[PDB]
Structure formats: structure tokens, C-alpha cells
Point group: D2
Chain length 106, copies 4
Amino acid sequence: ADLEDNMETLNDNLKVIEKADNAAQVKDALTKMKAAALDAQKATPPKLEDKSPDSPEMHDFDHGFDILVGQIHAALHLANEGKVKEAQAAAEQLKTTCNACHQKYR
Amino acid sequence: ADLEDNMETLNDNLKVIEKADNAAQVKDALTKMKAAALDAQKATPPKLEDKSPDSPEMHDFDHGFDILVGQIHAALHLANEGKVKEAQAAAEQLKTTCNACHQKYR
Amino acid sequence: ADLEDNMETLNDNLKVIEKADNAAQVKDALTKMKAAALDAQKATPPKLEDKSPDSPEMHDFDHGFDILVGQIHAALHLANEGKVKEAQAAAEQLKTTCNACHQKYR
Amino acid sequence: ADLEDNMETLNDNLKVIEKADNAAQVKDALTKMKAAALDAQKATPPKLEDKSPDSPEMHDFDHGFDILVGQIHAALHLANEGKVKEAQAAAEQLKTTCNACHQKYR
Ligand code: HEM
Ligand code: HEM
Ligand code: HEM
Ligand code: HEM
Ligand SMILES: [Ca+2]
Ligand SMILES: [Ca+2]
Ligand SMILES: [Ca+2]
Ligand SMILES: [Ca+2]
Ligand SMILES: [Ca+2]
Ligand SMILES: [Zn+2]
Ligand SMILES: [Zn+2]
Ligand SMILES: [Zn+2]
Ligand SMILES: [Zn+2]
């Protein structure tokens, strides 16, 4: 999928997590977010189209996804332990990573 | 230092971060928590004293600290960007990692 | 792409890197291996098809890819520095990771 | 300990790994290398004391240690599997990380 498609999947699933009632629903949404994040990672965003692949900016862009994926990983552990409210809180808190990257590269 | 001492350091700095007025205070506190987590990471907790250093339990224990350290790292980005409330919120959220490891190994 | 196809992509590029004489070739090859490794993570291998998504086996399987991805990342740093032979050795190095997962989950 | 002494621990143990005759000796030295690398992470090199802990340089310096620690973790897995020759080759290979950082910040 292209970058924007994966971003939509990321955004859609955050909403699903916010309104979910049980752990299974949260786990499923988080799993989809992980796949979308990883798929997004191979993209070169418009704002960095003219930068070299080895540029500090592309390295930072990639690092942003690593941070996100890590937060998704931790959230999954919480969901897997049936801690719905905590997993939901983790999904909400990681919005700060979405924001940080957007400020720099969206 | 002893596992328990690093744990005391982690607990106290969560309080320092909560009471912080500014970004500098939160950064310093996160930095201290990082040191404590990495030092605590080489210890053998009492409940796993009978386990081989190479065991699923000790690998998971080690992984738990990696999760915590990754959260401190993300929180540090927020504080370094002057986002005091966000960094404070990130510190609050990572309490779930503290709790998750305790439930299994404390 | 599916698990098997991403694997063939990993194998083909490892061979490309081995025959490479310039950094551009190595960079391109690792780039493709990174995309393939990440794409493969969304897959559930046949051997773990009937194990819970949160099983220790699935967490270990995921860990294997993280180790692989990290090795690719380290190799890319060397490739981007024009250190061809160093990058090639890093690529050869990680075959041990390929083998480890295969013995356990293939 | 300080940055300098932890670096000594890293250097000495690499020699121990090269001279090692069994898996346990290698695992033991790698374990000491991990502790030293992590403990080392809490330091600001002389050449970066002028840079903010928030600069791209300080972040890159920090990242370097994470790369090294990841390579140590992967080497541990090999040593734990009794693959002495392989673990020795991993140790030899991670020397590129040692050099890559030194070139920039030593
Ligand atoms: C879960 C967190 C995230 C959410 C919910 C999210 C959501 C979105 C949405 C709704 C869009 C606009 C979609 C469109 O233009 O069609 C977008 C765009 C974008 N996102 Fe994110 N995003 C997240 C994390 C990230 C991260 C971590 C990075 C960087 C490492 C990033 C980089 C981008 C870029 C570069 C664009 C612009 C794409 C374009 O206009 O071509 N995003 N994101
Ligand atoms: C910021 C998060 C954390 C906080 C605030 C925290 C706080 C504490 C505190 C106050 C204690 C009691 C110490 C004592 O009574 O002497 C403790 C014990 C312990 N913590 Fe944590 N901890 C955190 C994260 C972790 C993590 C991530 C792990 C595991 C990966 C962990 C493992 C333990 C263990 C095993 C003990 C018991 C030590 C013993 O009884 O000897 N902690 N922690
Ligand atoms: C660069 C390292 C790797 C290379 C070169 C590689 C290569 C391959 C190749 C060529 C195949 C298909 C062989 C056949 O047709 O029978 C394969 C299958 C497989 N690999 Fe890997 N692999 C690597 C790493 C990994 C890792 C790290 C894991 C696990 C974490 C893994 C899990 C699997 C599994 C589960 C299969 C079987 C898929 C199926 O039959 O449906 N591989 N790999
Ligand atoms: C296992 C790999 C490594 C080995 C064997 C190693 C070894 C050493 C040695 C022997 C020294 C000289 C100590 C002295 O002055 O007495 C040194 C210095 C230093 N190392 Fe490493 N090192 C390694 C990895 C790293 C990495 C990954 C970084 C960067 C992230 C790094 C950064 C430094 C710096 C900045 C110094 C200068 C210290 C000073 O000026 O006091 N080293 N290293
Ligand atoms: Ca759009
Ligand atoms: Ca104690
Ligand atoms: Ca106190
Ligand atoms: Ca201070
Ligand atoms: Ca095929
Ligand atoms: Zn995990
Ligand atoms: Zn960072
Ligand atoms: Zn890097
Ligand atoms: Zn491991």
C-alpha cells in the first residue's frame, strides 16, 4: 500500500481502539496498525522526495516508525493480558509519535 | 547497584516528573530513570534466581526493561522538543510497563 | 507478498550483496531486504498456525525478525559509508539469524 | 564506571572472546560487554560535551551504542546455542560498530 493508504489504516484503527469494548478487538486493531506502520516504513514521503536515501532526515523518518512500532508492541502486551483500558490508553498516548513525525515531515 | 535501589530511583523520578514545572526537570528525571533501568537490567530478580541466565523467563525479564527503556527514549524526545505535558503524560503511561513486569516477576 | 516470497527476496538479495562490487548495489539490496523482512512479519508461518497470536512461540518468531532487521540496519550504515567489504561481511554475518528461525519455525 | 574504563572492558573482553575455547567463556565475556556498553551509554563524550544532549550528534552517539548492544544480544543467542565459532565471528564483525563510532566521535 502507499504511504497515505497506510496512514488512513493507522488513523482508522486508532478510532476503533478508542471505541472497542474488549481485548480481542483492541488486539486486532493494533495488529493491523503494526502491519500498516511497517508497510509505511518503505515509503519516501513527499517532503523528503528530493533528499538522498542516506540523508539524516530519512534516517530520522525511519526512526519515527520504529518508535511507533515499539509503542504498538507494548500496547499489544497490555491487550494480550486483557488490560483493555490500559491498551486503549497506550493507543491514545502514542498519538504523540504520530504528531511528532507529522510536524517534521508531513 | 541493587535491583531494589534502582527500582526506588525509578519510582522517585516518576514523582519528580509529575511535579515538574518545566521541560528541563522532566528531561533530567527521565535521564536518571534511564540509568536506573539499564543498571537494573543486569540483575537477577529473586523469583528467577533458580533460572538459568539463558531461559525464557530471563529473556522476557530483560525484554521488559527494553520496553521501559524504549518508552523513556520516546518520552525524552517529547521533553527535548519542549512538550512538557506530553512527556509527563508519557511517563504516566509507562507505569503500565512497571506494573506488568511486577505482576509477573515481583 | 506472502511469507515464502519475501523469503526468496531475502535470499536473492543476500546473493546480490555477495557478488556486489560497489556500495550502491549493496545499498539497493539491503533496502529490498529490509522491505521484505518487514513485509514478512505480518505472516503466520505454517508451523505456528494453530498457536495463539500471543503465544511465546509467536513472540519469539517476531523477535527473530527484529534481530534480522537490526542486522540489516547495521549493514546499511556501513553501506552508506561506502564500506563495501564491511557491509558484505555484515550480510554474511546475519545468515546465522536466518538459520536460527528456520530450525525452530520452518 | 566512566566512559573510558567501560571502553577498556569492551576491548579486553573482545580479546577474551577471541581466545575463548568454549561457549560459556564467550557468553560470559559478551555478558560483561553488554553491562559495559549500557553503563557507558549514560556518558557524554569529550567531543560532544559542547553539544546539547538533544542534538543530532548526541542522538547518533546514543544510537551507536544501541547498535552495539543489539549485536551483543544476537551474539549471545549464538553463544547460548553453543555455537562458539559463530559467536566469535559475530564478535569480530561488531568491531565495525566500534570503529564507526570512534571515527565520528573519538
Ligand atoms: C498512529 C500514528 C499515526 C497516525 C494515526 C497517522 C495518520 C495520518 C493521516 C490521517 C495522514 C493523512 C492521510 C492522507 O494524506 O491521505 C497522515 C499523513 C502522513 N503521515 Fe502519518 N500518521 C501516524 C504516524 C506517522 C509517523 C510515525 C510518521 C513518520 C515516521 C508519519 C508520516 C506521515 C507523512 C509523511 C504523511 C504525509 C503523506 C502524504 O501527504 O503523502 N505518520 N498520517
Ligand atoms: C518505571 C517503572 C517501574 C517502577 C516505578 C518500579 C518500582 C519498583 C518498586 C518501588 C519496587 C519495590 C522495591 C523494594 O521494595 O525494595 C520494585 C520492585 C521490583 N521491580 Fe520494579 N519498577 C519499575 C519497572 C520494573 C520493570 C520494567 C521490571 C521488570 C522488567 C521490574 C521488576 C521489579 C522486580 C523484580 C522487583 C522486586 C525486586 C525484589 O523484590 O528484590 N520493575 N519496582
Ligand atoms: C536473511 C535471512 C533469511 C533468508 C536468506 C531466508 C530464506 C528463506 C528461503 C529461501 C525460504 C524458502 C525455502 C523453500 O523454498 O523451502 C524461507 C522460508 C522460511 N523462512 Fe526464512 N529466510 C531468512 C530469515 C528468516 C527468519 C529470520 C525467519 C523467522 C523469524 C524465517 C522464517 C521462515 C519460514 C517460517 C519459512 C517457511 C515458509 C513456508 O514454507 O511457507 N526466515 N526462508
Ligand atoms: C566493542 C566495541 C568497542 C570497543 C572494543 C571500543 C574500545 C575503545 C577503547 C580501547 C578506547 C580507548 C579508551 C581510553 O582512552 O583509555 C575507546 C574510546 C572511546 N570509545 Fe570506544 N569502543 C567500542 C565501541 C564504541 C562505540 C559503539 C562508541 C560510540 C557509540 C564508542 C565511543 C568511544 C569514544 C567517544 C571514546 C573516546 C573516549 C575518551 O576520549 O575518553 N566506542 N573505545
Ligand atoms: Ca492525502
Ligand atoms: Ca536485593
Ligand atoms: Ca525516595
Ligand atoms: Ca542537572
Ligand atoms: Ca515463490
Ligand atoms: Zn514483547
Ligand atoms: Zn530517538
Ligand atoms: Zn541507524
Ligand atoms: Zn533475544
